[PDB]
Amino acid sequence: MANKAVNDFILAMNYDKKKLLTHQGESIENRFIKEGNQLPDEFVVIERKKRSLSTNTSDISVTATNDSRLYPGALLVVDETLLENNPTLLAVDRAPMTYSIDLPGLASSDSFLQVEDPSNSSVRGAVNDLLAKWHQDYGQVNNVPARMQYEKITAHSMEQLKVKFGSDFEKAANSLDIDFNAVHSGEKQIQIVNFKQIYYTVSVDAVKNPGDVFQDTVTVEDLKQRGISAERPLVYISSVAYGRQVYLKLETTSKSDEVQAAFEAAILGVKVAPQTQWKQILDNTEVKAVILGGDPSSGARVVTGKVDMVEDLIQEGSRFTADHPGLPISYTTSFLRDNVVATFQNSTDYVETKVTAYRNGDLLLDHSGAYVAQYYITWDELSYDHQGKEVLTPKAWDRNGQDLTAHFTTSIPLKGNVRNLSVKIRECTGLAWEWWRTVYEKTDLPLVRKRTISIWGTTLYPQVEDKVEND
């Protein structure tokens, strides 16, 4: 009867499929805090980051994988962690389960066995057990059907400049001589190497009822007290594929600025003749990659990154058996409630980060162009009263609108408690048809630890760039 009750409870939730699944957040955030009027007053904030191919991690990734190693038989609560590729695996002892491992070719009887329900004992013990068996009995013969996938995208370009100028002045009195010589040389190099391959593929046996989720003696009331309401559902890991992933990225820049001026003179009286030169060399070399696959011999070469990396890795480790061990790549979990809601996550999860600042956090304004813009820094400021109502006292900056031709640098540090900040940095283009232009504009900006707003360019193409960091 308990099992039936558990099933009825699971059936009862009628959570919307689109809204519930689409439960994500934004970029940065901020949360204030005020209580009482006799102690102190502080404020904090919260920001979020994302990874993909730019700023990735390997150790971190590995750690994440270990945390969510529910290849078969899982139950992640659909709330926030799931969407962020990192939820909880809270699940009471359940019934036995079976996992199939389709490959190049195997037996039927041995193909499917019997697995229990643990964290990293049966799933890792059973899978590994069978995995070794295949490599043991089956020496070679059949070839593992591994789907290869790798794309290469490089981008290298250089730029040169040779400006020569030579003129001399001579009148019926004084004689002069000018000499200008400068050369420009700037070339950049960009190349992105990618590589992916999946061989191992684990799958689970769809669930019919709560027989796999809960055992004989289950508690529908004790399990609901933990964290199983209507807002969040129980998500269980579906299938899983193994394999590796070859990564490679490197970029090298170069620039040269040689200045050589030659001045000559010979006027009736004094003889001045001087000549100065100039030199400047800038180099930038950076390389980084990651091999999720997990190789050895053909691993060092790839890591270094030369010419025989991809090939050396895609020619020595073809036959997937034991030579090259696999590694968790993709991840797929299913919702154990109505055999419908299925989530499709990746392998790289986002890393949360939250800090606090007592009286830190100031706004900087770096202007380096050939245009006159009027900064409109204006923000409000709350405050507690004797009764218990939060008042408001807007206080605009001292320089609320005015022309400021380059160079121009400043910064409006914060000030304890605050809220809202209207800034209007409209650059003056002048022209003839218009008069005022609005480049950058943001409403109710988030109190960032260290935000910077600089605009590089001329009076035609505003190349503004806002910098917001929170170390």
Residue numbers in the entry: 1 to 471
Can you quote the paper on this entry?
We determined the structure of the ring-shaped ~2.2 MDa PLY pore complex by cryoEM. Comparison to the soluble form revealed a complete reorganization of the toxin upon membrane insertion. Of the four protein domains D1-D4 in the x-ray structure, D1 and D4 fitted the map of the pore complex with minimal modifications. The elongated two-stranded β-sheet of D2 rotates from its vertical position in the x-ray structure by 90° around a short glycine linker to an orientation parallel to the membrane plane in the pore complex. D2 connects D1 to D4, and its rotation results in a roughly linear translation of D1 by 35 Å towards the membrane surface and by 30 Å towards the pore centre. In the pore complex, both bundles refold into four 85 Å β-strands, which form two parallel β-hairpins that insert into and traverse the lipid bilayer. The β-hairpins of neighbouring subunits coalesce into one extensive, 168-strand β-barrel with an inner diameter of 260 Å.
X-ray structures of pneumolysin (PLY) from S. pneumoniae show that the soluble toxin monomers are roughly rod-shaped and consist of four domains (D1-D4). Sequence comparison suggests that all CDCs have the same domain structure and therefore insert into target membranes in essentially the same way.
